[PDB]
Design a protein around this ligand. Sequence first.
Ligand SMILES: [Zn+2]
Lengths: 151, 34, 1324, 50
Amino acid sequence: AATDEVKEIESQYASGLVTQGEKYNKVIDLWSKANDEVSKAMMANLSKEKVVDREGKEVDQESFNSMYMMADSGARGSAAQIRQLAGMRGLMAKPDGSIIETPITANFREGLNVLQYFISTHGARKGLADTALKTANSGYLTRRLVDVAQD
Amino acid sequence: VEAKQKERDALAKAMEEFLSRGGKVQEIEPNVVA
Amino acid sequence: YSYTEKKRIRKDFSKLPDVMDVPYLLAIQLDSYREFLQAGATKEQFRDVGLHAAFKSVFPIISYSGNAALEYVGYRLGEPAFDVKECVLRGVTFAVPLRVKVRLIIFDRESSNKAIKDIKEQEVYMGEIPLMTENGTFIINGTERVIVSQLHRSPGVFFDHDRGKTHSSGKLLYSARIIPYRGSWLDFEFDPKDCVFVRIDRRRKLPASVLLRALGYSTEEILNAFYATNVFHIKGETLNLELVPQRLRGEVASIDIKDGSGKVIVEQGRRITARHINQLEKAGVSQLEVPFDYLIGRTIAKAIVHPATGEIIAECNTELTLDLLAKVAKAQVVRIETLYTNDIDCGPFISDTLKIDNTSNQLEALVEIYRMMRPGEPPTKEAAETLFGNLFFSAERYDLSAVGRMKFNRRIGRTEIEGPGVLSKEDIIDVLKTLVDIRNGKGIVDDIDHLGNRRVRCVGEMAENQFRVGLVRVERAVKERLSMAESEGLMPQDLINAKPVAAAIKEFFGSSQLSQFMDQNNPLSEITHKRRVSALGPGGLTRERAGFEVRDVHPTHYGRVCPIETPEGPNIGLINSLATYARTNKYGFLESPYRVVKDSLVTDEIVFLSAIEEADHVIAQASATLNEKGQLVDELVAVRHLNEFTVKAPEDVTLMDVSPKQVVSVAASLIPFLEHDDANRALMGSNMQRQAVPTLRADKPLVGTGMERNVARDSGVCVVARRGGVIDSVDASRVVVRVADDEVETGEAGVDIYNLTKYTRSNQNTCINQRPLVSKGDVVARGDILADGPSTDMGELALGQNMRVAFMPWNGFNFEDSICLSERVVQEDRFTTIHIQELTCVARDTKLGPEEITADIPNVGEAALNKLDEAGIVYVGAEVQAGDILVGKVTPKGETQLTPEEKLLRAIFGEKASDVKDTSLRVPTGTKGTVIDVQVFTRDGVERDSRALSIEKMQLDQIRKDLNEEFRIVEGATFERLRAALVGAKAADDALNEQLEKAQAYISDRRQLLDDKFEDKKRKLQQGDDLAPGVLKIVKVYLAIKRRIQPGDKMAGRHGNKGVVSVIMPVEDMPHDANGTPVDIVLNPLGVPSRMNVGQILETHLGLAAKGLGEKINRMLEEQRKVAELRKFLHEIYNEIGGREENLDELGDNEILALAKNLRGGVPMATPVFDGAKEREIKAMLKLADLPESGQMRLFDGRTGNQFERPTTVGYMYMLKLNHLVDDKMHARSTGSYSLVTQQPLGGKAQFGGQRFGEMEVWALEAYGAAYTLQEMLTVKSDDVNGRTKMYKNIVDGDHRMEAGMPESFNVLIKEIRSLGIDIELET
Amino acid sequence: PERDGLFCAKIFGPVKDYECLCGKYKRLKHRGVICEKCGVEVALAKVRRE
Ligand SMILES: [Zn+2]
């Protein structure tokens, strides 16, 4: 449905009605709307993933699978990490300052194609750049920050 | 670039004219110092 | 079909058919070396860049104020006489000469054909060639070093935004960084106040008008041609204007332009729209009338000098005023030259830059560029002109290739792709037009993080630049030496000097950062270190120069640069890698092939597409629905046209991907299920696979990608078959094969030797060896695998081993990401590793006394003397313990000033007063193994040790043995050829006699050939090698440590799950299933949600399925069934949904039994990176082998015995072994020798030092409110004289007093402060 | 080394422990005595750092 919607967006952009910025803002909030929609749907199907009954037909409770256990416990990671594993991966943004309008139609269970992984690798390299520079920047700031507070 | 190439072509043409205009080649030894 | 595929076939699951085979990995450095060296060529060599192109630009020379010329036809390559296996054990570093023929032609200095004295002779060998092997590496003084592809910025001019805090503006233009290939670095900075000012390395800011006047262009013509093209006249109604409809578009006209004979166009106060533009276009009135108030805002282009007045009434590049227009009217000026600028048009910043600082004269620009280069010197016009010519026009210390001119022509717009290598002022006109076009806003700004803005270099261009620098240095030296010399008084060979080019080729490989040591611990490291794309080094960005610009990627890297391959640590993003199917261009550009697709059908030919055309063309995706007709079934696919992913039409695209493995490099592609993992942990797993170590028993990997045989084929440590045929005899030291009658010459048919690499030393102190995997009496093919190297088995890459693996947090042993092993890995020696440890000892010569290898060493016990012989070296294969003396080294001493305690303890034991100390090297702590061999090097004409005689006699009998066996195999081949020849019509006779004489001539030629080969081996092994000066003999002993599994080793898988093993837990504590196989290595289930890779579960499920099929075929071979059941078993295996079937081809007696005996230890898979195996085939493979479909096994508790009320998951995980052990990192030091600048311990006393107790350590120490340990660790553990002595006496005696004392750190500080003359005293 | 230099023994001290520059006094008893041939003071090896 969102692919038909973005095809409608591309046709109404090629017909000459709106500019690039309006449809760009439209895709970068509707894709995030679909993202947290399938995220809360993932929370729903992870919470209702148990079929048990005791002297009855059906009974619903919390799920007895390890993903829901590690989601409710929250030891390492959060609820935004299983969207990449099961549902839609999210919307990695370009490191130049823009966002890529094409979504991640596949997931980690079924298998990504070349293009969605090419979108994901840009955000992956950006996160590697932040985690590589943040240690040096934190050391450079703390080497004066504890130096002023040694009296 | 082009000037060095033109100088190389002129030197090669002068060497060919000298070799074809009576001049010979002096084959010195491979290991000889004055 | 290869012979290795008969023993092992891979079940693939590629739904997309393979359209292109995997090309050569190391072909880029191969043809770069072939272009730079030009070994095999005709008499007419190629005109490309290289050593010949560097020699032809310099070798024609002319003497200053004289007559001299040097001509050359070409050079002659040298023959490599040093063997590789003897130069890694001797240290020759692959020496190869290179001789050139120079023609010294003299003249009479009159530009005529008079006194033509030509001397054509061969010169001396200009340095030594590196002479690398076919594997792609070269040895540099014992060790093997490789080059790195320098991914520096591309040669040319770029225009980026670069929004920073220094500009303090939202929209600003960055500085134009002109980047040549070598030297002459020029800058062009755009000032924010509508100006442009160039920059230099050490000089200050200079205006662009002075730069143009120094280049040659006048300021008036540049200011005229820079802004616009408009002329002003005084005709008719006191003025005449040339109306331009293009400039008036979008400009609010505040005046009346009603000229045009009663036709008004735009009234006063009306904005000019497209209707007024169309009205002006249909009118065509070139003359319009404006008032004089509009001319005040305009700026003139050149100076207005009237011929009737005789004086300058208007300065050059000045504004027009109300008195200046009246002066120009009263001076009767016919034509007035001025510029026309509008608000909607480009801003007149070039005129404001040219009007600054009063730069209008050529001599002022000359003295300005002289003060910019040499400030405060004698201002001369000729010297400054020669300096500017050598900096810009001349090629003296300035080399620019054609790729910079090609990039400049692609940037500024030109039809010719090839340009001149020398820079001119016309390129300055193009770059000023480009910067004012960028400041206008038209076009797109360049991206510095692009693949087009980062050119991938190689060793050839940098080696040619270094050789050109050394050659122009030698040419300057020869011109300085032959200045006052003559033709008959001097010599052409004595005038030239091959020493600067030899020093240049020495520093290019010895002291250069790009020629670092090759990572030879793993073959993945060996194939990836060639394909590294680093931005550091000379002419590039270092680690602190990266920032947030070159550490990011642009989507133009589709198939060119893999971002999932970079070393982790302090440098991520600037060191990149080369992709798999990416092939470089002739211009050094990174390009990737793409499949051209039409609107209806799909073409078959493939063209390598660059990056400049992908921004205009549409690139589709190869992972699409195809109905075997050449068209896409879907009506919408994810494509990309303007370097951005979008949706397009199937009839609109023109290009698509060739293979999905063309974007990933060869490091990350060996990890299965890349599309199920994140790039972070796949990058981490690829880094640990690059930093891997081989194992003892090379077990084949269970879940494979299919390119394991490919990366084993391109690896130089494997044995590749040049010619096919039958194999006569297989030995672990050498193998021989026969040559068939088809692919052979007339004489010397069977000649094929292959020296297998024995147990030698690698670069990371690990063992390397070759193991044969063939039999006797089998035929092979071209390119077949004969002997596999380390971490390779039976033709495929086999790095580690596999064991039973479950996902469970078991008793906190796998606490966060840790590992819990089992006793099978230590009882079967599965994941044990053996390192070869080096120990280089020297035997130098001192002035007070020489040293030698003497076994009579003082202070040597029985256990040390029993290991060493009468020579002084331990025997081959002796057990070396911790603290053993290996080499023999006795150093003398004189005037030692001995203490009475030392002579007392010497006189008590009755030993002789030996004045010669013992400085023999020993093993470090934690090394207890067995030596394998010792390599000794002596000088020419020196005394030799008897152990050296035993070593050289063993080497010569081994060499004579392999020469005798190759002579035996070639005479057996000649006799079997003669016996196959004589049987035809045995019962004419002159032919048989002739053939016997030809065979006798061939075997006598082979005999004299092996005689001269043995003479060469004797004259190369008996001579001395080039060693360090002042050294008599250099020995090195190769100690091999048989390291086992210890508690605390490093263990990681393939998806970036780092872990450390805890202890050696037994085989019973692990949980077991109902079949009978307990699990071995248990992992934690945090690796799947936290690290974003679910490929752990899929890989362990496919490993469980592969072990189920392997146990099924093992019990099928045990049950002694017929071959029909085995081929039906292979038929039901190889007929899944994914992949293809290759059955009904192999024979039952030979190939089926061969694949059984070579696949009983597991089967490999073949999955691609982005279109691999789906889950349903995995469910089928789980359900067909009596295994559960979801991996939900039912296990039994080994510890408590209670039945689990939950099904668990087990399987097989193929993990890797790392070079992160404890023995190479263990520092054992209690007391260490203090330093010379302070009393802090350090290494050098056969003990490794401690860690750095820097600022953060003492900060965390005083984080708590304590004060006593802060001074105790600072005055007792270090920095004292008598405090450590009194504290040790208090420790020994028992009583404690804790005296304060005085440390020596205050003494070092007071001496370093009183060295500047500073009064410091104590009050007290 | 010789006298009046960067590594002189008269100004700084001995390169070894309890020895003089000329090599006449090599004992352990004298700590603040000066030799007659050379104007150096025999002391420890740590007095180069004083
Ligand atoms: Zn003395």
